[PDB]
A and B are shown apart, each in its own frame.
With several copies, the nearest count.
Chain A
Amino acid sequence: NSIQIGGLFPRGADQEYSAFRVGMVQFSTSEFRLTPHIDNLEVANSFAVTNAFCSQFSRGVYAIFGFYDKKSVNTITSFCGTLHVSFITPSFPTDGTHPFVIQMRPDLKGALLSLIEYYQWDKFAYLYDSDRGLSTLQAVLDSAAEKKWQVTAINVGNINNDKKDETYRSLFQDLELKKERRVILDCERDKVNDIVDQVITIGKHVKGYHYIIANLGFTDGDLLKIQFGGANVSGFQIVDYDDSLVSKFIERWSTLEEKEYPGAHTATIKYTSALTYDAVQVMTEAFRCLRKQRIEISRRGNAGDCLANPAVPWGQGVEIERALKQVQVEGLSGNIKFDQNGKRINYTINIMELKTNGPRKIGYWSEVDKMVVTL
């Protein structure tokens, strides 16, 4: 049998879509499959997100897989919660509690705070992007008094904006005037090298810097010490290429034709794409046992049904929500288990450093223990 699901993909999430398609093949069986309906939307636009979500609700899907950003996360949480349709996502996890949301992405804040302590930093720059969100910066600032940290926070989201000259002045005052050499980069993974390149032109004795890349995909982009001007570089990784499950996946993924499967034919997979593939496993495990409702016809959705039709009865929707949250599987992102609010628990984040021979795992942070353990 088959179960209909929605898939809401942002422009530029090409590799994540390839990973979704590959997941659908991997986890389908002759006895059960998911039937996705894919919409492609501007996730920063809450009106467009509302239209997409409501169209999927209209079509009558068991769940919606998709993405949100800072500007649209409240649309997703409020609509999910009201209509009682589960939304499973690799997007940044929300600080608070919200029903009908399954967060594939482990929290990063805990591991980051622990890593700062592990290196015994007491003074550092924190380069953030306000459009990306400030939750992690806030966690660091909250801990700074107790931990004795002198943080200099700089919004590099404005590095090309009207606040651009202000941003360069800020970087200059911290790196040149105050001689800061410890730098945390909290940004989109594919923006790291662009920000670093700017830091290198602005600072001095840059070989002596130590960056922490505050992102769950340390090795998602090229890591070349030369690109970092010889500095130390540390970060986090949830996809462990030493895992047999992951290396087997990559053996298959690395030969997929790149035109047909955008973003594939690579030796690595972006953590968000890995989480997307894992989400297909989770939905498959959750749904394969649910009741085979009478085979109905699937019809294009009408967004207006958000206002015209009543919410899914809570008792109906909660069965699907609970099925998703009860899943326990191993995936590309390691051990996958959820708490009652759809947050990943019992996960492990690998702690990485860029060494002579390339990136190396130097330790790990487990959600149960919440400290950096050295390997």
Chain B
Amino acid sequence: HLNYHVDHLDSSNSFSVTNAFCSQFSRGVYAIFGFYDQMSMNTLTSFCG
């Protein structure tokens, strides 16, 4: 069975983004589906990496 949890993120802020990623991360997800833009990309891909 495939489950998911969604978080909506503004992306205007690197702080807002890190917090949303870390929240989802502490829940114990096996992968993340999502979107980045020019501002949020480095945060998300660096944490994922």
Q: Residues of A with Cβ closer than 8 Å to B? A: 45-48, 50, 70-83, 306-307, 313-315, 318-319, 322
Residues from chain A with a CB closer than 8 A to the CB of B14 are 46, 50, 73-79
Known: A46-B42, A75-B43. A315 touches B17 (CB 8 A): no
Main secondary structure of the interface of A (DSSP, over half): helix
30 contacts between A and B (CB under 8 A): A46-B14, A46-B18, A46-B42, A46-B46, A47-B47, A47-B49, A50-B14, A73-B14, A74-B42, A74-B43, A75-B18, A77-B14, A78-B14, A78-B16, A78-B17, A80-B15, A82-B13, A82-B16, A83-B15, A306-B18, A307-B22, A313-B19, A313-B23, A314-B19, A315-B7, A315-B8, A315-B19, A315-B20, A318-B7, A318-B8
Main secondary structure of the interface of B (DSSP, over half): helix
B1-38 contacts to A, CB under 8 A, are 7-10, 12-20, 22-23
Known: A307-B19, A313-B23, A315-B20. A78 touches B42 (CB 8 A): no
Residues from chain A with a CB closer than 8 A to the CB of B20 are 315
Residues from chain A with a CB closer than 8 A to the CB of B17 are 74, 78
Count chain B residues whose beta carbon lies closer than 8 angstroms to a beta carbon of A: 22
Of B39, B42, B43, B47, most A-chain CB atoms within 10 Å: B42
> Is the beta-carbon distance between A319 and B8 smaller than 8 angstroms?
yes
Residues from chain B with a CB closer than 8 A to the CB of A322 are 8
> Is the beta-carbon distance between B46 and A45 smaller than 8 angstroms?
yes
